[PDB]
Structure formats: C-alpha cells, structure tokens
Amino acid sequence: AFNNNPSSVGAYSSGTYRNLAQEMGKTNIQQKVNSTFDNMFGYNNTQQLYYPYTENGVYKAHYIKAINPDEGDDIRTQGQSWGMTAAVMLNKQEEFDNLWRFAKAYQKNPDNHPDAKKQGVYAWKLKLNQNGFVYKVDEGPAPDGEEYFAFALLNASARWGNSGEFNYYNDAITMLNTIKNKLMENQIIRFSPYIDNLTDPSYHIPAFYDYFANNVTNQADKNYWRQVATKSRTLLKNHFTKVSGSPHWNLPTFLSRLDGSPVIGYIFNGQANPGQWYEFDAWRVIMNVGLDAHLMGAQAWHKSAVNKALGFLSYAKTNNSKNCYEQVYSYGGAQNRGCAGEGQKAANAVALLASTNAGQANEFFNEFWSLSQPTGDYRYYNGSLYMLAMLHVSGNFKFYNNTF
Numbered sequence: 001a002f003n004n005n006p007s008s009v010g011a012y013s014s015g016t017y018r019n020l021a022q023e024m025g026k027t028n029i030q031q032k033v034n035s036t037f038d039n040m041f042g043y044n045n046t047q048q049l050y051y052p053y054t055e056n057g058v059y060k061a062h063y064i065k066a067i068n069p070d071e072g073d074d075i076r077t078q079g080q081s082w083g084m085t086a087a088v089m090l091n092k093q094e095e096f097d098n099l100w101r102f103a104k105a106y107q108k109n110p111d112n113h114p115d116a117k118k119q120g121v122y123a124w125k126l127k128l129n130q131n132g133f134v135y136k137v138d139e140g141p142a143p144d145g146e147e148y149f150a151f152a153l154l155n156a157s158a159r160w161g162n163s164g165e166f167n168y169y170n171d172a173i174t175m176l177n178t179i180k181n182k183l184m185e186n187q188i189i190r191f192s193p194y195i196d197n198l199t200d201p202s203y204h205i206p207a208f209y210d211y212f213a214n215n216v217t218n219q220a221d222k223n224y225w226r227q228v229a230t231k232s233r234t235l236l237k238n239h240f241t242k243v244s245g246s247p248h249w250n251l252p253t254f255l256s257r258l259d260g261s262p263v264i265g266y267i268f269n270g271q272a273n274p275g276q277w278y279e280f281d282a283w284r285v286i287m288n289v290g291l292d293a294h295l296m297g298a299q300a301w302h303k304s305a306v307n308k309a310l311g312f313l314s315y316a317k318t319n320n321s322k323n324c325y326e327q328v329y330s331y332g333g334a335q336n337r338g339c340a341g342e343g344q345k346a347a348n349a350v351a352l353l354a355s356t357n358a359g360q361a362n363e364f365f366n367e368f369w370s371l372s373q374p375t376g377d378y379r380y381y382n383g384s385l386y387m388l389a390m391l392h393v394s395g396n397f398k399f400y401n402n403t404f
C-alpha cells in the first residue's frame, strides 16, 4: 500500500530507499525499469534517444537527440546530463562515458572564450549542420544541465573510480566550480548569466546541493553547497507560498524572482513563454520536490506543495472537455496546449514521494504506470522524464557518496 506518511528522515541519511511501484502493488518493476533504459539506449529508432556521433565514418561519442519536428532536431545539455544520470543509476558505464565524451568535446565552451560569462559553461543547443557535423547554435548555458552533469559525474566517480578514460571526480569538481563562478547569483541558480534577480524553479534540486556538499573536500566549499541547499529550499518554499490560491492556483511557474515571486509576462528578448506559465519547465518542479522529500526527508512544505498542485490538476481535469489535465496553465486557466503527455504524468508520479493522499497517489501513479514508453516526434522531453521517473519510482535513483 502507498505510504502516505513519508519519513522526515531522507534515504540519503538512512540508506532506506522507497520503492513506490512496489508500495502501489506493481509487479515486474525492475524488468520494466531495465527495458525502459534498453529501449531509450537501443538502436531501434522508436523509443531511442541515445545516438552515436561519427565524423567521416570515425566513431566519436554519443548524444541524447532532442528530436524536434517544429524547429529541427537539436542536442541539449539538459537531455545529455539526464542521460548520464540515468546511465549511472543503472551501472551503464559505456553509455555514460560516450555521453560524457560528447559533452566535454562538443558542448563545453573553451575556458579562454572571449566572453568570460561563457568560459567553461556548456553550450545549451547544438545541431548537426547540412554535412552532418556538430556545431554550437547557442553558446549560452542551461544551468540545470551543468547541475546534472556535476551530479552524474560525482556518482560515476563513487561507483566506478577515476583511473579509466575519465577522472570523473576531477571533472565533477571542475563542473561545480563552473556552477559556482558562472551560474549562481547570491547562491541561487541562475536562469541566465546575463540577467540578474532571475531563477527557474525547475532548476532547483536542493538534495543535489547537499550531495555536492558531502563530496567536496575543503571546508569553505562544504559550507557553500549546504547554504545553496538551504537557500533552494527557501526559494521553493517561497515560490509555493506565492503560487498558493489566487491568482496562480497552486501550480509553480516557468520563471521566478529570487524571493519566489512568479515572473509576470515577458521580461527579455528571446523568452520562450510568459514567466507565470505552468509549462514544460514547470512540470519538473513537483518532481524535484518529490525527489528532495524522498532523498532528504519530507517536511510540511514538501507535502503542501505537492498535495495542492496535484489537487489543482485533479480539479482541472474535471473541468476539461477532454477529461484530462493539460500541459500548460496560466493563473489556473488552461491554455489549450494539449492533454498531459508522458513526461508530465511521469513528473507527477515522482511528486507522490511527498504526497500524503493515497487516493491522489492511486490515480496519479496508475496513469503513469499504464503508459507505454514514449515514441514519436515528441519523445525527447517525454521520454527523458519517463526514464528519470522509472528510476525514481523503483528505488533506483540513489546518491552514491565518494570516500575520502
């Protein structure tokens, strides 16, 4: 049965990881997790997201392909870093290494880049040109990419050691210093090096920062990352307070001020969507809350964030002509951007790790568990989140500490 009283002691501390699928009475859980990875990282061109990159017939590395029928396929640090995270959780070293080789070679901006704000950060968008060779479309970072790179690399070091192709640990510490120096403002993760007083709630994963703190060696950096963790919880707490009730109706948003205030409308040239939209980025917020509750312990704010968000979506479904909750809401209003897909349902399943409502849990978990693995033109985002969710709900998303 669903544990509707999640511990205030996290799995990171106790070493006790929940198996949510097991709680929900599912069978063949590990088989399903394994097949999910095999399909995503298999040459089937169906669920597949993991693709080899070759140059003049010579194998180089692998990437997660951000398939895009609307603007053309591209390659993203977000998907790359998620791919590495999935690989390390399942002990898939070759897949990890092939993805990390790619990121280091092709996504990393040179340390002597003329723009100091871009030095050593990871170019968020690559494409293959008309001749099949990789190039940077946009050299600017998407800082949740770097966050997951650091997380994945620290775990790779812990699991596999540092004497092979990669010194994962050294790569991880380099990544952390890059986040600290290039991608932070007042110890809150930036949306952009070029904009101040701006964060993206979906980038906040407080448990990662606690993990970072326990895996650096020097006192100053240990304290630095623990402070980042506390400030992130505060940011998320503040954001959820501000979105509670009218006018945001309990869903977190795309963009936020450093005090947790949703960004209203457009604020910069190039902005994809209004700041106050619960859209594609925002899907991940309660997933992250569930992650943090599971790993670092469930507090009152975790439960309130998730219970109220899932509560809204359940309500929104009853007031939808298609009997679904939708992908995009603004001020509690449906924006007609389609019924929830696999990735959103996956994000919402992980959120259940902070839920205290067995009824909610039953509905949201079964909607996710009944899905087939994403295929087709929109599987990049849905498939990536689906993979992460499968790990989270099977007790496979673990923190592996390094030893000193």
Ligand SMILES: O[C@@H]1[C@@H](O)[C@H](O[C@@H]2CO[C@@H](O[C@@H]3CO[C@H](O)[C@H](O)[C@H]3O)[C@H](O)[C@H]2O)OC[C@H]1O
Pocket (backbone or CB within 6 Å): 066, 076, 078, 280, 281, 327, 337, 338, 339, 340, 341, 342, 378, 380, 381, 382
């Ligand atoms: O990098 C991430 C992007 O990959 C992400 O892109 C959005 C993914 O979802 C698309 O909408 C699909 C439309 O068709 C169906 O309804 C699918 O279920 C949807 O996923 C959007 O068009 C893309 O913009 O955005 C978030 C970003 O972090």
